[PDB]
């Protein structure tokens, strides 16, 4: 039906848009080990396997930034010492799979009963902050790679990688990403505005991000004289840098023999990733059960077999057909490599920054955070502040802030990394034990009152 | 007193900021005949002469864009045929001065009783549109002067003028002006925002434009490797391009003998300029009398004697001392030529564009113009639309729009120019005769109801 | 002074929307019976909600003193212009309201000439959906103007499409006789309209307005009204002399006759 | 059932802010006089605004049914918590109000032990600036039953710093005797506060609340109150049985004694 015709394309766009940016980021952090296509196939197969077996087939299994954060932290750690990233990840997957049965024998979803708003809200805020910090660090990267000069060099080879800084790039890319973010904001406000009658406005507002990415691509096409960093997409059904990885992966290593003492030592990261995905799931379960959760964990563990990243839950009978269609369209999307290689990276970074900012805008914790600076004479009437002393809420905000700052510091230090989930998790008992010791039950029933 | 200490500096900044951009524009349109310094001296002497003799010494005599528009139209006409611009302007001044006595003998301010909101509002809108169009045409100029290439040439002499297109300029200047406009908008919103307690915020908000111009100058100073188009300021008490004009001007011409048949034929432009300044004055008189008006006209006529542009009214006992101080500070400002020559032109263009946009924002006609596109279900309650049929107001808007389009077309055509004031003025009788013939008195009492 | 109140109704014989008089005030209130004789003269009594809503309406009510009008068509147009001018209404509804403004006016002599009178609410006609009726005054009681007694006509109707109830008063430059049956010239005119709403009895509301205008001081105030504020002040003083009687489980005619001195006190205050 | 009303006042002998009883309801209203003893029993009468404002207050009034309270302090604290909880008040004023909530309570036996009783408006004490003090009852009338008279105490005061008048009612899980002089246990409590405002007579307002609660059906409704809505509905029924007496230029005791059947009709409706 026409309703299904529009919905399938809308959901396909919504699912494909973040995937492109995620794959671009993965290709950026990795040398070329993981790009878009591998994760694209992973989610392609994920959609169909989940739709066939799923308590809620209407749900979507996309990818979330914290997964990328953990993956890049693992990449950094593997860069600290001579290690095989992919094989290590495969071993982590093995640990996941052997862990799954422990929960299959007896449910372990009890912690679902021990989740709090105060924890997940600040976690999301921290994730947004890290998004912004990475986006900003990219500008430093470009400035250092392309120092501001006036002479430069002539006819520098740049097909695989720019051998020398060239003019028209350290600033034009900034223009591209800034325009992307600006237009995304404009289209968001327009969607939330009074222009055009209802449906006529919201129909295009829902596709703002899908549509506010092609204008910059057209501009880049019109300006073909100056090189820009774009996608290095291989041919169809071909791995990114086949000289470094193939579809078939040797657990003993392809170029280097994986350490034996690291075979059985890969358990520690797996539980972290498991906890991350577990806490991620319940958030998407709120719109309205260990079978679906365990299925997702098993699928994530399997996804590492051939060298693809794991996925995560995302937003929203013919339910199974819907999942089937989006998954098959995702699989088909792999074929546009030639045209997609014209797409520059600054656009992806701008879209990622816009997504992070918009995700931040949905947090009430940030609202109260910014209200702290706001004078105590114009606070909007919210049924959690008018009945509470302002300074008390400031104390709660400062506690959250110091936790966030400690997490940020841990993130900054490279030697001590991959421990962020652990330090974050030990916060929940603090909310369950320390917070009641300081604040009244009625007081606490207004701040972290999850709905 | 400290209040006077702050007010004098604040008004000095407010007066100097637009003068720099106006002088830069004059130097741009002219080869080098008129820059900043000449107009700077003109206003320097104007302030003191007006403060000593003025019914309202608190008023300010700045410069307005329409004066520049008329001057550049005259420059274009003088470029059409072999003519002397400066001598022609001096003769126009003579016509002004002999005209002044006609009104001195008997007042001619009757037309002050025959001014309407509908005319001046659309006039201001058109002026803003022309500002934006000029700013955009500058980008075309730069693109043509600096076509996008990859090779260019080495060590091109650029001290007097770039002999060849060079890298790092056709786009970096765009970045500079865009940043200027962006920061100006940010500081404006911040001023109109809730950040910081009252005075602490508005004190810097009032200086946004004075302050959101130095950051880009500092950036340019940090990036000294790439040439940018900047101010060509001569030494103190020296005319811009003395080989082309001196303080003493021969009415018979300095390099070419002025046509005799154009001596007595210069009357026509003078009355246009006179009408322009006359209509400009009453707008600034609204905050709360032929003596002050005639004094201003005479001063404008005199200002052309030595080759300086005329000034115009601007925004806001010690009143005489205030005018004295700002005028003397303006005169002193001429001495910063060496440092000012480091200032690029893109900053001035960005500030000019921001000023035009902000001036546009203050027009209610534009509000109703944009409301026309807005659906007829969310219009804010204004006590001129809820009592009037929407389509009728649309008819009024379309009449204004077609008048504006005709004015724009006349502006576009170079052969037919300098007639914009005449065609604009004949609109007032149309409002006084045609509009009542179509619309009711009660209807018309709501749209152009000037306060 | 003579006051007469008319309700927007539809006769059952011709099925046309018209205005039918419901009560008159000549010295004392005479309520018009169902068919078709007047009731006994009696002193008016009003319910809370009618008063509450009237005060609400009069807070933003429309008043057109010194109206250069002499006919129902002229005053109708000027009131519509002011109602829009005050943002009270949109221009779109003026015509249908103007259609209502120029409907026929039936009188007691025509009551037996009509098949029946029932409340009508303006649509686009219809009947009120809220649980109103029956009229108390009709159950209770239905079972002289050489000069100064200038006529006053009050019109009450219901219009669902209206957003809020609207109050419209006109004081003509000269009292005029249009199309009242008695030879009494009309100077003061009132029109009360609005959508159906809880605690909104248009009948009681119209009775309250007639009762307020029946006040001799309020008459004088109306004659010497220069702005809406003066009428608002006259209302407040009138409302300062009101004395609500809450329900009481043990009625006593002795506890009554004790509020008569209070009544006297309030009426003395009204006189000041 | 017994009902007693107390006003926040200051004695002229000790100059301390206290609560002094003004009237009592045991079968019929006895108003307390100055040096004179309780006035004669009489049937209550109320003015318009007092009622108007009461319904305004009760539209957003606070009610605490089956409250686990047995003393003044406990119930005082729970009401302050709910008043803030309902956004009715800010937390800052709680302490001063709590100070008022725990003031001494004087009785008729102590009236001659005090130099004088005058209205007090809470500040930061002061006196009302508005032209009020219109009690009327004293001007009119002032010149042992615990079987089924579950005591009810109503407290009325004025506090300028408050933004709007506030209504607080608290139904206790068990009727309790705190610090009423008669051996009657208190279960229903009411506190009415607010800033000084036009048409706001706290005395008349408190009398109106006591009169409403004096309703035998309203008593039953209060006993079987489950939510604020039921009390609101009981009020509206009580309001539907109200019959306002407008001032009348020609008083007649014959036109009175005709509203007695109407009174009967209204009470019958109240009983339904």
Author numbering:
A (entry chain A), B (entry chain C): 420 to 707, 720 to 747, 775 to 909
C (entry chain D), D (entry chain B): 67 to 190, 194 to 212, 228 to 263, 270 to 362
Publication passage describing the model:
Anion exchanger 1 (AE1, band 3) is a major membrane protein of red blood cells and plays a key role in acid-base homeostasis, urine acidification, red blood cell shape regulation, and removal of carbon dioxide during respiration. Mammalian erythrocyte AE1 is a ~100 kD integral transmembrane glycoprotein consisting of an N-terminal cytoplasmic domain (CD, residues 1 to 360 in human AE1) and a C-terminal trans-membrane domain (TMD, residues 361 to 911 in human AE1). Here we present the cryoEM structures of full-length bovine AE1 with its TMD captured in both IF and OF conformations.
Two classes showed fully connected CD and partially connected CD respectively. 3D refinement of these two classes yielded 3D reconstructions at a resolution of 6.3 Å and 6.9 Å respectively. The overall size and shape of these reconstructions suggest unambiguously that they are dimers of full-length AE1, each with a PMAL-C8 buried TMD and an associated CD. Both the TMD and CD dimers have an elongated shape. The limited direct contact between the TMD and the CD leads to a large corridor between the two domains, providing an unobstructed access for the substrate ions to the intracellular side of the TMD. We have previously demonstrated that there is a flexible linker between CD and TMD in the AE1 monomer that may play a significant role in the red blood cell elasticity, providing a mechanism to connect the cytoskeleton (given that AE1 CD binds various cytoplasmic proteins) with the red blood cell membrane.
